[PDB]
Amino acid sequence: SNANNARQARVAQSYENSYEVDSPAVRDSVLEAARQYNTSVVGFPILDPWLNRASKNSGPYLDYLQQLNPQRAERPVIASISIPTIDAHLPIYHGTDTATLEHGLGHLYGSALPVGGTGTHPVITGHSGLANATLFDNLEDVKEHDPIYITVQGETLKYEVDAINVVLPEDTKLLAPDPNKDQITLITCTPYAVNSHRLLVRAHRVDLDPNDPNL
Amino acid sequence: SNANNARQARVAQSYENSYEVDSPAVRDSVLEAARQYNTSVVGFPILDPWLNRASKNSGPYLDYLQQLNPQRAERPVIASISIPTIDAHLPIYHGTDTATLEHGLGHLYGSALPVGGTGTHPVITGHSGLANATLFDNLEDVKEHDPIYITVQGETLKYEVDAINVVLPEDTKLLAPDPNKDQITLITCTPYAVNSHRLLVRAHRVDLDPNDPNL
């Protein structure tokens, strides 16, 4: 297809772009643009990612896909996450479509991008129960006070778990941003072979000791 | 599988590594290591990539896979190529296995890496006739004097076509390195629906005018 040719050409072009957008000053401006984006989506409604699909050719969604993507790739990794107490180390991608969640964690459209800052609440989504990848199967083992490390554009952000809740999919109040807090939530479905509910592991930003063993 | 988990974890780790290996000094040392590698493989035999398979778990092959890969990814793009007279813009990957050649161009193991230098002769391989990607279908339209641009670790190399030959697969004499020349060959199979022969488009290095319209 023309689709495939275009896809191959874009892989080439983004490889080339990546050597022109990786300087400290461009990482800083990509991150600053992500913060501006986060301010602009503060009111957005937040839909369940297993039960709904985002409108992926809308204008704002196409804009979202340009954030954290100075190379202009298709489906780039936007950040990584590490949860060493359950030995998880996984890439995060834009959105939560079916193919994304088979190969990594998805970022829930309508929530802040995971670049830190007060007033933000990124929601990072993973399957549990997918054949042949662990993903968030062990999120239910995470405990209060466990650390979470996000890496994004060369920066490392540290979060500590503070709440663990199980809720119905319609109920997203625990996902609200709070203008005075820098938080993230990890979400997966539960229980095993049913997935009628959502497990929400919330964490808040803490200082990163430069000598953290987990770095 | 554990294989999938490991693959996902490595995607995360290489995303993180990519922000630590992209400085000018590391691009220079990756390129210098590639030149050293090229010197070490000057005598290697060169097998037809459609008719043979490299031993992909041998020691030297695993070393090859670490070249042009400071991020330590699985199957990274190692370089891109542009041939504007046939409107081709494609990524190049290590090796020439089946899955590589479905998604881009492959680099023929045993030939120099495409980083330039006298005494080198990289061979870049593409299919013709694959359903649903053009790849090297139009290589047969390339003419003498046409330019070829390789981009690698942020550098751009310009080559100009000087020979076009059709040969049998066993016959690789036109692929020999020449200690006084900086050359590349593009190879595909021919003719349509038969692929009994190989089309070899050879080009030599020329000065890159910084104001080349094709940049």
Side-chain angles (χ1 to χ4, degrees), chain A residues 65-130:
Chain A
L65 296 183
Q66 294 172 74
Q67 296 291 327
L68 298 174
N69 190 10
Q71 67 275 33
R72 303 310 197 217
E74 270 166 54
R75 301 179 166 266
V77 176
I78 62 165
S80 66
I81 187 176
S82 175
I83 309 168
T85 57
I86 58 172
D87 197 24
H89 194 201
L90 293 167
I92 303 166
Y93 294 90
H94 290 105
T96 52
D97 74 16
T98 302
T100 299
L101 297 187
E102 307 244 355
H103 304 302
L105 308 174
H107 167 268
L108 176 57
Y109 178 70
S111 75
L113 301 163
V115 297
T118 62
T120 68
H121 199 159
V123 180
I124 304 310
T125 299
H127 279 308
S128 42
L130 188 78

